[PDB]
């Protein structure tokens, strides 16, 4: 959908910027090591 702030392609390989199905809370998820947080990665 329409998204001005396209920042979900700036994270390192293995991570994915997703949204928490609880209330719609944006965060990052690493499906390679199973590490997810709102805390920006560094890889």
Residue ranges per structural domain of the chain:
11-43
Q: Class of 11-43 per CATH? A: mainly beta
Q: How far apart are CA 20 and CA 26, in angstroms?
A: 6
In the three-class reduction of DSSP (H, G, I as helix; E, B as strand; rest coil), residue 43 is classed as coil
Q: How far apart are CA 11 and CA 1, in angstroms?
A: 20
Q: How far apart are CA 38 and CA 35, in angstroms?
A: 11
**Sign of the torsion angle spanned by Cα atoms 29, 39, 24, 4:** negative
The approach used to solve this structure was: NMR
Other CB atoms closer than 10 Å to residue 43's CB: what's the count?
A: 10
The residues with which 25 forms a beta bridge, in sequence order, are: 20
Q: What is the token pair recorded at 29?
A: 């998820």
Q: Are 12 and 43 in contact (CB under 8 A)?
A: yes
DSSP element (H, E) containing 18:
strand 15-20
CA–CA distance from 6 to each of 1, 29, 33, 34, 42 (Å)? 11, 17, 24, 23, 18
């Amino acid at each position: 959908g329409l998204e001005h702030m396209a920042d979900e392609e700036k994270l390192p390989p293995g991570w994915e910027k997703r949204m928490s199905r609880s209330s719609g809370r944006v965060y990052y998820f690493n499906h390679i090591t199973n590490a997810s947080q709102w805390e920006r990665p560094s890889g």
